[PDB]
Ligand binder design. Structure first.
Ligand SMILES: Nc1ncnc2c1ncn2[C@@H]1O[C@H](COP(=O)(O)OP(=O)(O)OP(=O)(O)O)[C@@H](O)[C@H]1O
Ligand SMILES: Nc1ncnc2c1ncn2[C@@H]1O[C@H](COP(=O)(O)OP(=O)(O)O)[C@@H](O)[C@H]1O
Lengths: 225, 745, 225
């Protein structure tokens, strides 16, 4: 028996999917059976050439190494400590819509990654969605075991500064913060400012494989008299 | 399910028997001595001896401490029973003792311990069991390590007992029998029952009680004289129920260092938060929480404030109960008396002779007493002592007995022998000597009890006895009739008459009949309390009396209040006024709900202040008539039993020449005659010791002490010095007062 | 003053002597009977010619001197400590199975040594035995003086991290995990997982060396009457 199995089953569905992806990335990269020619994150292919061959490999193939181990560890502690609050952001219902604008966040951040030439689009998306959830109810502080009264809503910025001073590769998280602010403004402006036949209809195929769940009436009882 | 029984204590002291109600044997088809398998916590299964005991209810199973440990279950738990008479006699069994009791024994356990304990006792035993065997000095324990047949077998004469081997190290799960249980406490049955009542739910079923949604008690104050086992009681309760008992001492904390001591307290509390329903015990509060008057420095104020804040914030939290040990609630700061704080109050009184007897029985369990021990006599002679006193007495009595045999015991150079130890016996002379080299500590302390004097101890006054019974017993016997009639019973009864009639004896007799506590207050104590300390002492006296309800309070030498007030001194007016005012202001505050009675007695009714003679206060007045002839004969007979007896001169005749004599005078005459009889006995032994000097060892026949044959010579001596202690002028004054009251009212 | 002597002199004779030989083998290696440069297990040389003098010589010895004694001494300390801990239960009267497990671990590790090109097979033995120990009694709660989440089947990734920061050649702890889990499966899971016919068959000579002992009845006295 393995307590790891039910521990991971205890993880809520969104963090379940993200953890599955982020643990499959290193294993898939280190498998070595599959030809890496499909997966190199080659800048020349993705930037100038059309190269429909590798339009999505950026988030899957990733050179894992001792480049962000300490930051990844502190984020692992953060998720282990607060995934409950992480998963409960205003989307227990309509979770298909939640995944919808998370995919929209992915497409906007990869647009940024095409326009700009940063290093890793892994932290910025998750930190941006977590911090936008926080900002919708901003400014209640929190601290860890030894944190006496240290203020919250600085942790993204504390990490940014720590990476900026010692080490490197901090620009992508701050550009993700910028695009997240853009997304925060857009989720309020775009749907009501302009129409355009509400863009396009959201596909029901995702509902076909992974439907959303709504109210259930169960069964009633005759009151009688 | 007709197999679940709530565990209960077994009156039987055997370690392999169980007591059941008769329908249990009727339904389960159980014979006497049947081996029945039991179920419980930790999946522990064993067998015992089925014994009939109708005392326990059908759901109640009587079963002792050792088997409770073997089953790893506590009191109040339900067990499952199933018959299994298919056991077989043991053939060869290898058993071993647990290591942490064998230290320094150097002896063969088989013959010294195992042979007498297991003498064809037919004890059903199993592999891997634990049991205890008493010894002359220790209480050793053994474990069955190998059995044949397995796993169950029966003690049989053909039992090859492999008793020698390496001592067994502790099983690392403790469950030691060295703990303290309810059986280890004597003379506190009422208080123990009260605590066991109001501790049960918060500790046994925290989930159910929490789901109920009722605030449990949180503050309990055990108070009494030091060295009475209060900490022992708390530890025993904690071990019995099972908790995370944490102990805190006063001096060890208050004089810790600088000002960080508070953290330790905080530390203690937070640990309870991580450790389930737990008991927090703190000792010697007055040493750290006195009244603010005594507080001279500042740090103590900070300590008290911090502890108050800590304990008041204990609302909800967990099912943690806190109790404190102290001596006098007066010394405690009143601020720690509000609701939510310590509100439950329990006092531990000084045990009587009987309680001393159970304490001695507990402490002498290991000792090999010789056939000369009268524990009851020692308990009678040891009034004014405490549990620590008796423990020390037993310890140094055993030490004296051993030291008397230093020659017998090989002093040698290692662990002593066990057989020599087993050969030691304790003599009553050792106990007498221990008494000689002893002193109690309580001594000058008020004792509350039910007196022993019965009705027949005093003759005459049949109408007086009937009136007292009518005034006292029936109102508490039949409150319903009073409720129907809408009546309040009287409480203040006063006695007036010639001194020396045994009025105190009457009070003791009526208290004994009512079977309630008795409290005695003397005029000496009152006059001592006159100057200065009067108010608080009276208040605490009445508080104690209310605490021990139902009870009878007695007052003596009341007229002495006036004696220094109006007389040759005339200077104690302020103290007398203070005392009288305190008494009046406090006694009327008694409520009819309390079943406490007040009795006053005096021999100078004229000088008594009229304010007491008020309804609600002392109103019932009973004269004390002198015994007459047959009454005098009855008193003489009552005083005559004692030990000597001699019917050679008409006692009724001597009563008839002694008409108009007080009962105390008659008792004095009896004791004078007894002294003359002792003089005759001294004459006898003196002539013995003189005339066997003349004839060397002139003791061939047994010359016993003279049989009680008190001759008319002694009574003629008594009448030669005959004192009419009652004075006729005072008798006339008493009659004048009685007739004045009769005509006036 | 030398409490080391007092602590060593209180050790049980069997475990003291076995552990003394276990720690004296590295002393023989350190003396210089065979140079450490002559301990590499050349694959082709072992394949073609014998070279049977150094398949296990480097396994039982570790190049420890007055530069890294702390790790070696603590490893042997916990080795003996866990040896006694496993001596407490189960192997209190059945040393045959204990020695069978030790030799099983050695056979597995030497099979892996022959198969692949690893160099220092001392720490790999540590992972093997430590994991088989920790997993023989999985699902239990234990804590050291400052145990935070000290739990079964969790020390393997702890030593994963500690060897990642200090050391290398990750495959060793992988093989220790594999052998520990295989033994654990063979103990409880295998009998009702894959039918029957358990493979716990001790060879005759191995049982001849150290057979399981039996409790003696000792002398007894009849109770009589
Ligand atoms: N009811 C009792 N039953 C048996 N032994 C008792 C009893 N009361 C007192 N003793 C004996 O007297 C001793 C007095 O108790 P002990 O000194 O251990 O604690 P305490 O009275 O609660 O107070 P403190 O902790 O201040 O000493 C006990 O240890 C025990 O030997
Ligand atoms: N059965 C009895 N009847 C009358 N007097 C008794 C009896 N037994 C003892 N006494 C005497 O009564 C005396 C105590 O009386 P006490 O209660 O002091 O009366 P008072 O308080 O009026 O002086 C004792 O000295 C004793 O000699």
């Amino acid at each position: 028996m393995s307590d790891i199995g039910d521990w991971f089953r205890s993880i809520p569905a969104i963090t379940r999917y993200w953890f599955a992806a982020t643990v499959a990335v290193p294993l898939v990269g280190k498998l070595g059976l599959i030809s890496p020619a499909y997966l190199f994150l080659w800048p020349e292919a993705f930037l100038y050439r059309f190269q429909i061959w590798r339009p999505i490999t950026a988030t899957f193939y990733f050179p894992v190494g001792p480049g962000t181990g300490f930051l990844y560890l502190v984020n692992l502690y953060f998720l282990y400590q607060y995934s409950t609050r992480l998963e409960t952001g205003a989307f227990d219902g309509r979770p298909a819509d939640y995944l919808f604008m998370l995919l929209f966040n992915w497409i906007c951040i990869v647009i940024t990654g095409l326009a700009m030439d940063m290093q890793l689009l892994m932290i910025p998306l998750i930190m941006s969605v977590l911090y936008v959830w926080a900002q919708l109810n901003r400014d209640m502080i929190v601290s860890f075991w030894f944190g006496t009264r240290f203020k919250a809503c600085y942790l993204p910025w504390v990490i940014l500064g720590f990476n900026y001073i010692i080490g490197g590769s901090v620009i992508n998280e701050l550009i993700g913060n910028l695009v997240g602010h853009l997304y925060f403004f857009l989720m309020f402006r775009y749907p009501m400012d302009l129409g355009g036949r509400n863009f396009l209809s959201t596909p029901q195929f995702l509902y076909r494989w992974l439907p959303s769940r709504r109210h259930n009436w169960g069964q009633g009882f005759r009151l009688g008299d | 399910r007709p197999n679940r029984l709530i565990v209960d204590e077994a009156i039987n002291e055997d370690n392999s028997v169980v007591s059941l109600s008769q329908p249990k044997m009727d339904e389960l088809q159980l014979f006497r001595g049947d081996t029945v398998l039991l179920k419980g916590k930790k999946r522990r299964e064993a067998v015992c001896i089925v014994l009939s005991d109708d005392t326990c209810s059908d759901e109640k199973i009587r079963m002792n401490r050792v088997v409770r440990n073997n089953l790893r279950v506590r009191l109040g738990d339900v067990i499952s029973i199933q018959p299994c008479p298919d056991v077989k006699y043991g053939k060869r069994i290898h058993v071993l003792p647990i290591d942490d009791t064998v230290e320094g024994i150097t002896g063969n356990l088989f013959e010294v311990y195992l042979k007498p304990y297991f003498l064809e006792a037919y004890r059903p035993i199993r592999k891997g069991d634990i049991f205890l065997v008493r010894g002359g000095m220790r209480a050793v324990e053994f474990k069955v390590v190998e059995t044949d047949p397995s796993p169950y077998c029966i003690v049989a004469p053909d039992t090859v007992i492999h008793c020698e081997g390496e001592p067994i190290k502790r099983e690392d799960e403790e469950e030691s029998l060295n703990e303290v249980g309810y059986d280890d406490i004597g003379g506190c049955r009422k208080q123990l029952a009260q605590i066991k009542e109001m501790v049960e739910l918060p500790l046994r079923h925290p989930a159910l009680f929490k789901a109920i949604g009722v605030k449990p008690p949180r503050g309990i104050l055990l108070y009494g004289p030091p060295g009475t086992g209060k900490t022992l009681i708390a530890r025993a309760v904690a071990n019995e129920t099972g908790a995370f008992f944490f102990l805190i001492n006063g001096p060890e904390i208050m004089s810790k260092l600088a000002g960080e001591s508070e953290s330790n307290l905080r530390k203690a509390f937070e640990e309870a938060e991580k450790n389930a329903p737990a008991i927090i015990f703190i000792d010697e509060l007055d040493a750290i929480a006195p009244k603010r008057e005594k507080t001279h420095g500042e740090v103590e104020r900070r300590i008290v404030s911090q502890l108050l804040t800590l304990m008041d914030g204990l609302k909800q939290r967990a099912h943690v109960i806190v109790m404190a040990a102290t001596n006098r609630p007066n010394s405690i700061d009143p601020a720690l008396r509000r609701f939510g704080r310590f509100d439950r109050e329990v006092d531990i009184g000084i045990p009587d002779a009987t309680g001393r007897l159970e304490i001695l029985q507990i402490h002498t369990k290991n000792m090999k007493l010789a056939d000369d021990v009268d524990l009851e006599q020692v308990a009678n002679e040891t009034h004014g002592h405490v549990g620590a006193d008796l423990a020390a007495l037993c310890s140094e009595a055993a030490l004296q007995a051993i030291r008397k045999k230093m020659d017998l015991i090989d002093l040698e150079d290692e662990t002593i022998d066990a057989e020599v130890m087993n050969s030691l016996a304790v003599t009553m002379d050792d106990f007498r000597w221990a008494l000689s080299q002893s002193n109690p500590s309580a001594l000058r302390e008020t004792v509350v009890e039910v007196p022993q004097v019965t009705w027949e101890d005093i003759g005459g006054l049949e109408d007086v006895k009937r009136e007292l019974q009518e005034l006292v017993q029936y109102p508490v016997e039949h409150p319903d009739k009073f409720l129907k009639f809408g009546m309040t019973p009287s409480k203040g009864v006063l006695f007036y008459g010639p001194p020396g009639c045994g009025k105190t004896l009457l009070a003791k007799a009526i208290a004994n009949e009512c079977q309630a506590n008795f409290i005695s207050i003397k005029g000496p104590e009152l006059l001592t309390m006159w100057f200065g300390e009067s108010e608080a002492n009276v208040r605490e006296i009445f508080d104690k009396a209310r605490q021990a309800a139902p009870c009878v309070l007695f007052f003596d030498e009341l007229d002495s209040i006036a004696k220094a007030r109006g007389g040759n001194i005339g200077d104690g007016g302020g103290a007398a006024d203070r005392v009288i005012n305190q008494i009046l202001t406090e006694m009327d505050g008694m409520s009819t709900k309390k079943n406490v009675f007040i009795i006053g007695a005096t021999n100078r009714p004229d000088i008594i202040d009229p304010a007491i003679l008020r309804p609600g206060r002392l109103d019932q007045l009973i004269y004390i008539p002198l015994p007459d002839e047959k009454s005098r004969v009855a008193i003489l007979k009552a005083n005559l039993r004692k030990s000597p007896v001699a019917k050679d001169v008409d006692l009724e005749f001597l009563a008839k020449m002694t008409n108009g004599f007080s009962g105390a005078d008659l008792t004095e005459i009896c004791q004078r005659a007894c002294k003359l009889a002792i003089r005759e006995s001294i004459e006898s032994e003196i002539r013995r010791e003189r005339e066997r000097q003349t004839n060397p060892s002139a003791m061939e026949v047994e010359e016993d002490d003279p049989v009680p044959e008190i001759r008319r010579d002694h009574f003629e001596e008594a009448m030669r010095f005959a004192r009419r202690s009652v004075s006729d002028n005072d008798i006339r004054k008493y009659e004048m007062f009685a007739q004045t009251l009769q005509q006036s009212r």
